[PDB]
Amino acid sequence: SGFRKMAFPSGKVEGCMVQVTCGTTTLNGLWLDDVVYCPRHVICTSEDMLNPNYEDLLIRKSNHNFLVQAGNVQLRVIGHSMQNCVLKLKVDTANPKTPKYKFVRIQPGQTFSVLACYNGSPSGVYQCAMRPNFTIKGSFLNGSCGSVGFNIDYDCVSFCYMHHMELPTGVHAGTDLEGNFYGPFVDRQTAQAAGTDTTITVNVLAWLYAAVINGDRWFLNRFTTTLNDFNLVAMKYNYEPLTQDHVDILGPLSAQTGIAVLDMCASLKELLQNGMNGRTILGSALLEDEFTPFDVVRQCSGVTFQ
């Protein structure tokens, strides 16, 4: 029993983290095979970052201008290219600790683990959700750029996030590993703000199933609803629309608990309209939307990774 925000074990990713320095700018890189991936603004000074011309700064750089360290080992750069907002440095050494891996662009609502790094070294690990507004609610200090987000499937690391920047309200934006931002952000220091966020409904329902599984069942009412009535009531509270796909995704939890998805929807509608009235669910006084159905299943069914 119990239900915690749980990250994926980080060891496979730890063995991929390097320090990248260019001029006086140092951040983190991801060393896979014989390529180091890092945010392309490693090639800027502070000054430059207000409105940088990245292809101009990069044309003026030679391989030797990039210092890549993996512990007390310098890796010689033998090539470099820019892919969108990500810089690729070819090195003369393939990373022996390269795991089985993919690059995935995740969808709003999907979670991942962030391995927060400084100077190519891990600080710690925690789970995040890609928010509907294409931000994450992270913990990142200066030096954290190049820190990555990932999922593990069994033996395979799916890299989905590389950290670039922090927006007002202390939320975070970055790219997939092909250097395309999530959301409308740009890698320059100018006024940008996150869009107004929404609550990930399917995830809140998953979390309500997690509660039931753990014996926290007070919020279950005797009623059902239609997907129609549910979506109308939830729109008022800034909840995303629940789709039939979302309903189908919730099937495993629904089947495990014997609670139809539209019954849980009725229970949630009552929580939204009536609030929690001094009560907690799974320790929490607010509804949690940063557990996916799969996360709930993994945690409550003990899925592991090799």
The site for ligand X70 (CB under 6 A) is made up of 1, 25-27, 41, 49, 140-145, 165-168, 172, 187-189, 192
Does residue 85 carry a catalytic annotation? no
Of residues 22 and 259, the one with the C-beta less far from ligand X70:
22
CB within 8 A of 286, min separation 6: which ones?
A: none
**Helices 201-213 and 293-301: crossing angle, nearest 10°?**
20
Alpha-carbon dihedral angle through residues 287, 289, 290, 296, given to the nearest 10 degrees:
90
Q: What is the 3-state secondary structure (H, E, C) of 111-131?
A: EEEEEEEECCEEEEEEEEECC
Which pair of structure tokens corresponds to residue 223? 């009623």
Helical spans, DSSP H, in 150-282: 201-213, 227-236, 244-249, 251-257, 261-274
- Residue 299 touching a copy of itself (CB under 8 A): yes
CB within 8 A of 235, min separation 6: which ones?
A: 241
Considering only residues 125 to 184 of the shown chain, the ones binding Cl ion according to CB under 5 A are none
Tell me the residue nearest to ligand X70 as measured from the CB.
145
CB 122 within 8 A of CB 115: yes
Among 47, 55, 62, 71, which residue sits at the site for a copy of itself (rule: CB under 8 A)? 71
The helix/strand/coil state of 59 is helix
Query: How many residues belong to the site for a copy of itself (CB under 8 A)?
Result: 54
CB of 179 vs a copy of itself, minimal distance in Å:
23
Of residues 30 and 117, the one with the C-beta less far from a copy of itself:
117
Kindly tell me the sign of the dihedral angle through the C-alpha atoms of 167, 172, 177, 183. negative
- Residue 284 touching Cl ion (CB under 5 A): yes
Beta bridge partners of 29: 18
Of residues 192 and 221, the one with the C-beta less far from ligand X70:
192
Active-site residue, selected from the candidate residues 38, 117, 128, 145: 145
- Residue 280 touching Cl ion (CB under 5 A): no
Does residue 80 carry a catalytic annotation? no
Stretch that binds a copy of itself, among 49-57, 62-70, 221-229, 278-286 (CB under 8 A): 278-286
List residues binding a copy of itself (CB under 8 A). 1-12, 14-15, 71, 115-119, 121-126, 128, 137-141, 143-144, 166, 170-172, 214-215, 280, 283-286, 298-306
Just list the catalytic residues.
Answer: 41, 145
List residues binding Cl ion (CB under 5 A). 284-286
